[PDB]
Amino acid sequence: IIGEKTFGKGSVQMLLPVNKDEAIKITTARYYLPSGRTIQAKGITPDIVIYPGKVPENENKFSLKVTPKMINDDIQLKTAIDSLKTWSIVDEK
């Protein structure tokens, strides 16, 4: 899991008939992860934190006058690729 902390919305609601005049929507259940932790109080904390932006380049304005090169405009996407590249290396056993 790469990126930032998520929003944390782990509730589900349901239409409850208060007779015929009124109806309420309230949380009828909450979500729990395979680890047992709940999702609403905290959300998901990723294994690798990387804030968005462009990929650095010591000569990024010297060079200045299907997912290639776009990886350079997205530092978060390039890191997930980097974790795949080490994963594919580890599976070479």
57 makes contact with a second copy (CB under 8 A):
yes
Separation of alpha carbons 40 and 13, rounded Å: 14
Gaps after residue numbers in the chain (C–N over 2.5 angstroms): 65
CB of 41 to a second copy, least distance (A): 21
DSSP H helices in the chain: 70-73, 75-90
Selected from 51, 61, 62, 64, the binder of a second copy by CB under 8 A is: 51
Distance CA 40, CA 30 (A): 8
Please report how close the Cβ of residue 80 comes to a second copy at its closest, in angstroms. 10
- The reply on whether position 87 binds a second copy by CB under 8 A is yes
Residues that bind a second copy (CB under 8 A): 4, 47-48, 51, 53, 56-58, 75, 79, 82-83, 85-87, 89-91
